From a paper:
All five domains of L and regions of POD, PLinker2, and PCTD involved in L–P interfaces were clearly resolved. The detailed alignment showed that MTase and CTD in MuV Lintegral–P appears as an integral on the PRNTase side instead of the RdRp side compared with PIV-5 L. The overall spatial organization of CD-MTase-CTD in MuV Lintegral–P is surprisingly similar to VSIV L. Actually, MuV Lintegral–P forms a continuous positively-charged tunnel from the GDN to the K-D-K-E motifs, ideal for the RNA synthesis followed by 5’ capping and methylation, which is favorable as the transcription state.
L and P function as the RNA polymerase complex, responsible for replicating and transcribing the viral genome. To catalyze the RNA synthesis in both replication and transcription, L sequentially consists of five domains: the RNA-dependent RNA polymerase domain (RdRp), polyribonucleotidyl transferase domain (PRNTase), connector domain (CD), methyltransferase domain (MTase), and C-terminal domain (CTD). Here, we resolved two L–P complex conformations from the mumps virus (MuV), a typical member of nsNSVs, via cryogenic-electron microscopy.
Numbering used by the authors:
A (entry chain A): 217 to 618, 658 to 916
B (entry chain A): 2209 to 2232
C (entry chain A): 2101 to 2113, 2127 to 2154
D (entry chain A): 1024 to 1077
E (entry chain A): 4 to 54
F (entry chain C): 246 to 304
G (entry chain A): 1186 to 1228, 1232 to 1299, 1308 to 1330, 1337 to 1459, 1478 to 1604, 1609 to 1615
H (entry chain B): 246 to 286
Write the structure that this text describes.
């Protein structure tokens, strides 16, 4: 053991490995998670069936890891969705049963045979072994097999590999439908007007009708009446091209809490190589006869705190005036993301101080005035009414015998790659109307415009550019760690506008299919509960078949609309089920939220990551995790006993493993 | 526009007719 | 109370359910009118 | 937070920091609490909605 | 002061392969790493870096 | 009244083409080139750095 | 048989789980599902509602209301609250007093997706606090209901997926040492002088020099003057109860055209409640019946009957819940408003039709009294205009 | 004159379709990321 490396050698297997400090922390966290999960499965009679299956899964994927390497996390991420695929393997509808199961089996076969490590027969046998641990389980247990995700550690990350994924989602040609963009823009305008009517004493916003508006639209503006969505779908050429004028007296300094949160800020472009380790870049800079770049360590919070002249109006003038598109100091870069095993989402971006301040100001402006106007989705900041709405949405089709009845088919869509697939040409009209409503000439269409004119890169101190002659970001090529002129957006950045566009598209698709739905868009996962009317006397299987047949048209329309605004929907992303939907990584199965207690117990460790490292903080963390265990279906008696046991264990560990002499 | 009457509805109606006759 | 019925009937030519419930309410009200005034018939 | 607040020179938060803020909060808490009956809930609320509490 | 700013106890940063490669190439540690596995680190003049 | 009648039929021809152009315009495709070539941004930077306050639709 | 009910104690929160539940099975077989009780967050009736109030203004109003509720309502207790608010706003004493919300029953409430349970068997559970008194008490009873739901859920742990027998939980909170009476809002003057409070006068996030506009100041002054002269609750006690009945009837009528009014209806004239409900509904439907050329009292009665019969059952559930309460139900029966008919058991009564019948009786009473000449007072809330001329 | 009327009624449709075309082309032009655009006021 050294402060920098650990050399581990085993005589039984004649294997020698080296572990850095971060890898040592991963291994000890993962092994603690394995111990916790296995011990809870041993203890609880509820999780008792899962112990053997989890053990065999661990063994099989450990040998697979030894065989492949870093690609076994692809298999792990595939198992992440195979949990849901097995969950939808028992729905009444024949035409939806086993589609996700078969597709995920095909994708696991692809992942196992891409490198020709396994032949087709061996790959099929391995897939059968992996799958047999998921069958013949209750729906609750099939969801609590989502604890295994971090039980195999995390992949060793490289800047080039992480940059390749984002360089392809971005920098790629994307065809879009003008009409689809204009139809969803018209529905966006309709929802904005209807929300502003539902507030502000039932009066229309200041609006200017276009020259193509019919008489009916003129009368509805004059009478300040609600825009029915069927009317909007008809006259979408005039509901759009409708300029909503200033509605909000919004100010950048409306909220102070946003300015007092520390966000990672990038170095000025002139010194972008200061992130990399000095040792690796010293010689390549010496051969170029240039000074070594200055390291950057400033924080956004400290920089904002130490400004004698800080006016949020002048901060927003950076974007409003057009100075951001001319700043030679601007520099944005990614960096490797911790505790992620999926290829997508392995990076997060950092900008300069002025453009981070502008971004947070714009996000606050959207979230306070215009974001409030669209509540077609059910997500709210109040968690209590949020879960009440989720339960109501899930229990649409569950009607007893205590005519016609009602039936529900649920659709879940993953929006992780949406951030990389957003394009200016599809968002400019929404950005322009938001700018008009807020009075700002040009604020919200800033991300794409600034990104197309700057070269991005992944900043990892131990991952310098492969070519030592590329010492300037602008002249860099579209390879290695560089992403030249990314046309898309970044995760989290301008998410309010994208969520609002997605809500408008969902409502447009629902209206086009004459189907009632209740969306619950949340930025990553959207859940749509397609609703239809069925005969009360019908059989349950036939009722669900009718619900699925009704939902087929809506799903086709939603796919067409998302493809029109440039988001191709594949089989991985969407999950059609007549029983459950997924929201915030929790499944809502037939009027229930499935337990997933093992995921909570897998993160019950022996110390808190806080700096003080007191015994009280660690015991409080353990108590909070035990509270989660009680809420997730584990025996309350067992949870109480476990809380006492691990509080004793933590105090004994702190006593016998003293941090300071 | 003719409506149908369940058996309990028929008992209701005939009892009401009896009440009306008794009171009027 | 048949004015709404005729109005929706002309508007459409959903609405049929409203038509049926209004008709049923009207006929039931007429029925209780008859039962209440059964003696003087 | 005190080390960043006393370092702050920003136009916003110009008067937020005070060297005797702790003494002022002690005096205000005494004002609300040194009564015939002590009501810590009321003192907490009134402090949180006073200038010192903001 | 270093007894408060202790090193992390749990994982909070990404695992970097090239950090481990740097530490095992700096000390000339035994390894079966192929030349492409090292990426840019194979072209370094480890002598100066070791010095 | 006859001239105004000649223009009556000709204007109907115009009406229809305008409808037709609208049809095609309503079904156009907005395409983003992206950066498939991977040319340095320096070179790709052939775009305005300045906002232009042009009115779209109403205004 | 319950041992607390059988021995003296009679306060409890009744929980019921039906038999025949099979999770992940045909929804028709198991009893009807519903969203369980997952909690109740904050849910102001101030003298004058201010729109667009600043954060500092809201904080000052909160401070003044809490101060007046807790320490007293003397003139010095108002001066101290005015000064403490003046540390955050610039209102004068008169508008402070006027705009401050009611200093009665102050809640003293002070400050990712983690559901409290799986809601597996709690969605089938019936809850009823009909045998309980019911803002500490509200929180206590919400805690009792949550505890009972969690107890029912741990009785059938996730290994258990069936219910071959129907279970009942009583959860008696009465005969308990812990529940206690509540006495507060006495006058406690400050034994210490007001401290010299330094104030960031210039800082907008702490102090607002102009929290009220000129129009807002004029409106609040007009409201205060109208209350001082015209008055609000200065009326004798004999006049408050009919006025409360009128106001709750207006609320019910606005509702139809868990929310309920049992708290108000238990302490007012229920017959007057339904009479004024009929009066308010008649005021709402007056223009509609006039444009339809309705003639005669029976025409109005038929129109209102069909209007009530055509509203969805979910809208009238507010009045249904109030009438279904045992005390209000017995009150309505004893006042000849309600007759329980065409149901072998009281629990099987069509309480939607029962509420419609009560409103119809009130409408008939109003029409008869108007015909004989008994004028009925019209109330115009939020008016100190043209809407009164319309009414 | 009747000819005139019809022509006025039909030129109303010409007006609305021409306005639709104008707005559609404006949206297209403002959709080019090459030239940043600003909303008036
Ligand atoms: Zn009992
Ligand atoms: Zn006690």
């Amino acid at each position: 053991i050294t402060p920098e490396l650990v050399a581990l050698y085993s005589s039984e297997h004649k294997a020698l490995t080296y572990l850095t400090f971060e890898m040592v922390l991963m291994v000890t966290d993962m092994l603690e998670g394995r111990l916790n999960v296995s011990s809870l499965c041993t203890a609880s009679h509820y999780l008792s069936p899962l112990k053997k299956r989890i053990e065999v899964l661990l063994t099989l994927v450990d040998d697979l890891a030894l065989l492949m390497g870093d690609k076994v996390y692809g298999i792990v991420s595939s198992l992440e969705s195979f949990v849901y695929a097995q969950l939808q393997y028992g729905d009444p509808v024949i035409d939806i049963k086993g589609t996700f199961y078969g597709f995920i089996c095909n994708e696991i076969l692809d992942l196992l045979t891409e490198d020709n490590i396994f032949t087709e027969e061996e790959a099929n046998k391995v897939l059968l072994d992996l799958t047999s641990q998921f069958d013949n389980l209750s729906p609750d247990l099939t969801a609590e097999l989502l604890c295994i995700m971090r039980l195999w550690g995390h992949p060793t990350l490289t800047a080039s590999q992480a940059a390749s994924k984002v360089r392809e989602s971005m920098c790629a040609p994307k065809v879009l439908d003008f009409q689809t963009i204009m139809k969803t823009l018209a529905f966006f305008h309709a929802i904005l007007i209807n929300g502003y009517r539902r507030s502000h004493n039932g009066i229309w916003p200041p609006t200017t009708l276009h020259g193509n508006a019919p008489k009916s639209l003129i009368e509805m503006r004059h009478d300040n009446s609600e825009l029915k969505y069927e009317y909007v779908l008809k006259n979408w050429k005039s509901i759009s091209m409708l300029r909503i004028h200033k509605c909000f007296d919004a100010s950048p300094d409306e909220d102070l809490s946003i300015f007092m949160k520390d966000k990672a800020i990038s170095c000025p472009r002139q010194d972008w190589m200061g992130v990399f380790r000095r040792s690796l870049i010293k010689q390549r800079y010496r051969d170029a006869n240039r000074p070594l770049p200055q390291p950057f360590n400033r924080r956004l919070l400290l920089n904002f705190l130490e400004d004698d002249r800080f006016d949020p109006i002048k901060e927003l003038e950076y974007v409003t005036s057009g100075e951001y598109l001319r700043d030679p100091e601007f520099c944005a870069s990614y960096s490797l993301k911790e505790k992620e095993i999926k290829a997508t989402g392995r990076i997060f971006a950092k900008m300069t101080k002025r453009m981070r301040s502008c971004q947070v100001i714009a996000e606050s402006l959207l979230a306070n005035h215009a974001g409030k106007l669209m509540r077609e989705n059910g997500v709210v900041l109040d968690q209590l009414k949020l879960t009440k709405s989720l339960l109501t949405m899930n229990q649409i089709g569950i009607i007893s015998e205590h005519g016609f009845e009602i039936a529900a088919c649920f659709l879940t869509t993953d929006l992780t790659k949406y951030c990389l697939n957003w394009r200016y040409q599809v968002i400019i009209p929404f950005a322009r109307t938001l700018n008009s409503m807020y009075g700002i000439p040009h604020l919200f269409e800033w991300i794409h415009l600034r990104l197309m004119r700057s070269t991005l890169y992944v900043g990892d101190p131990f991952n310098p550019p492969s070519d030592p002659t590329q010492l300037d970001l602008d002249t860099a090529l579209n390879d290695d760690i560089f992403i030249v002129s990314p046309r898309g957006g970044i995760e989290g950045l301008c998410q309010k506008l994208w969520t609002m566009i997605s809500i408008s598209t969902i409502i447009l698709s629902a209206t086009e299919a004459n189907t009632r739905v209740m969306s619950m868009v949340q930025g990553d996962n959207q859940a749509i509960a397609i609703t239809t009317r069925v005969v009360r006397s019908l059989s349950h299987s036939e009722k669900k078949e009718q619900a699925y047949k009704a939902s087929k048209l809506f799903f086709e329309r939603l796919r067409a609309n998302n493809h029109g605004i440039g988001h191709h929907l594949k089989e991985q992303e969407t999950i059609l089920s007549s029983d459950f939907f997924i929201y915030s990584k929790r499944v809502f199965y037939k009027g229930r939220i499935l337990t997933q207690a093992l995921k909570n117990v897998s993160k019950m460790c022996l110390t808190a990551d806080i700096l003080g490292d007191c015994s009280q903080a660690s015991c409080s963390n353990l108590a909070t995790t035990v509270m989660r265990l009680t809420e997730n279906g584990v025996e309350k008696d067992l949870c109480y006993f476990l809380n006492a046991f691990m509080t004793i264990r933590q105090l004994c560990y702190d006593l016998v493993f003293p941090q300071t002499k | 526009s003719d409506i149908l009457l369940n058996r309990a509805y028929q008992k209701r109606i005939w009892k009401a007719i009896g009440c009306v006759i008794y009171c009027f | 109370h048949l004015k709404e019925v005729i109005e929706i009937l002309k508007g459409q030519a959903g609405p049929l359910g409203k038509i049926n419930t209004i008709l049923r309410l009207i006929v039931e009200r007429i029925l209780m009118y008859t039962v209440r005034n059964w003696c003087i018939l | 937070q005190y080390t960043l607040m006393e370092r702050s020179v920003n136009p916003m938060l110009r008067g937020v920091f005070s060297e005797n803020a702790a003494e002022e909060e002690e005096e205000l808490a005494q004002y609300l609490l040194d009564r015939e009956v002590v009501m810590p809930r009321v003192a907490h609320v009134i402090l949180a909605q006073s200038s010192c509490g903001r | 002061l270093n007894e408060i700013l202790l090193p992390e106890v749990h994982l909070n940063s990404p695992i970097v392969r090239y950090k481990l490669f740097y530490y095992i190439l700096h000390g000339q540690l035994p390894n079966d790493l192929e030349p492409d596995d090292l990426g840019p680190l194979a072209n370094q003049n480890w002598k100066a870096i070791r010095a | 009244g006859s001239m105004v009648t000649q223009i009556k039929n000709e204007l109907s021809t115009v009406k229809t083409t305008l409808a037709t152009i609208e049809g095609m315009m309503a079904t156009v495709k907005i395409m983003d080139p992206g950066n498939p070539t991977g040319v340095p941004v320096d070179e790709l930077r052939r775009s305005f750095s300045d906002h232009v306050t042009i009115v779209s639709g109403p205004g | 048989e319950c041992e607390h009910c059988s021995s003296g104690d009679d306060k409890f929160t009744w929980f019921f789980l039906p038999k025949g539940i099979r999770l992940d099975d045909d929804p028709a077989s198991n009893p009807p599902i519903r969203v369980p009780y997952i909690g109740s967050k904050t849910d102001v009736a101030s003298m004058a509602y201010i729109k667009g109030a600043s954060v500092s203004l809201k904080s000052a109003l909160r401070l003044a209301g809490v101060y007046i509720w807790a320490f007293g309502d003397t003139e010095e207790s108002w001066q101290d609250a005015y000064e403490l608010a003046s540390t955050r706003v610039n209102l004068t004493l008169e508008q402070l007093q006027s705009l401050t919300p009611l200093p009665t029953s102050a809640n003293l409430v002070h400050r990712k997706f983690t559901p409290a349970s799986s809601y597996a068997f709690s969605s089938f559970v019936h809850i009823s606090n009909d045998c309980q008194i019911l803002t500490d008490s509200n929180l206590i009873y919400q805690q009792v209901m949550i505890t009972g739901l969690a107890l029912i859920e741990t009785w059938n742990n996730p290994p258990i997926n069936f219910s071959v027998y129907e279970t009942t939980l009583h959860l008696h909170t009465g005969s308990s040492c812990c529940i206690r009476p509540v006495e507060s809002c006495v006058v406690n003057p400050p034994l210490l002088p007001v401290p010299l409070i330094n104030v960031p006068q210039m800082n907008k996030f702490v102090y607002d020099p102009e929290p009220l506009s000129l129009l807002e100041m004029e409106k609040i002054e007009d409201i205060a003057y109208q209350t001082r002269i015209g008055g609000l609750d200065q009326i004798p006690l004999l006049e408050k109860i009919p006025l409360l009945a009128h106001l709750t009837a207006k609320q019910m009528v606005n509702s139809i055209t868990t929310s309920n009014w049992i708290s108000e209806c238990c302490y007012t004239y229920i017959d007057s409640v339904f009479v004024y409900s009929g009066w308010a509904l008649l005021l709402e439907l007056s223009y509609q019946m006039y444009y339809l050329r309705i003639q005669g009292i029976q025409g109005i009665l038929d129109y209102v009957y069909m209007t009530l019969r055509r509203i969805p059952g979910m809208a009238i559930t507010g009045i249904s819940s109030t009438i279904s309460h045992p005390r209000i139900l017995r009150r309505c029966i004893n006042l000849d408003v309600i007759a329980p008919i065409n149901s072998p058991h009281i629990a099987s009564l069509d309480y939607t039709k029962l509420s419609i019948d009560a409103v119809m009786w009130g409408t008939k009473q109003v029409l008869t009294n108007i015909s004989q000449g008994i004028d009925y007072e019209i109330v115009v809330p939020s008016e100190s205009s043209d809407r009164v001329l319309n009414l």
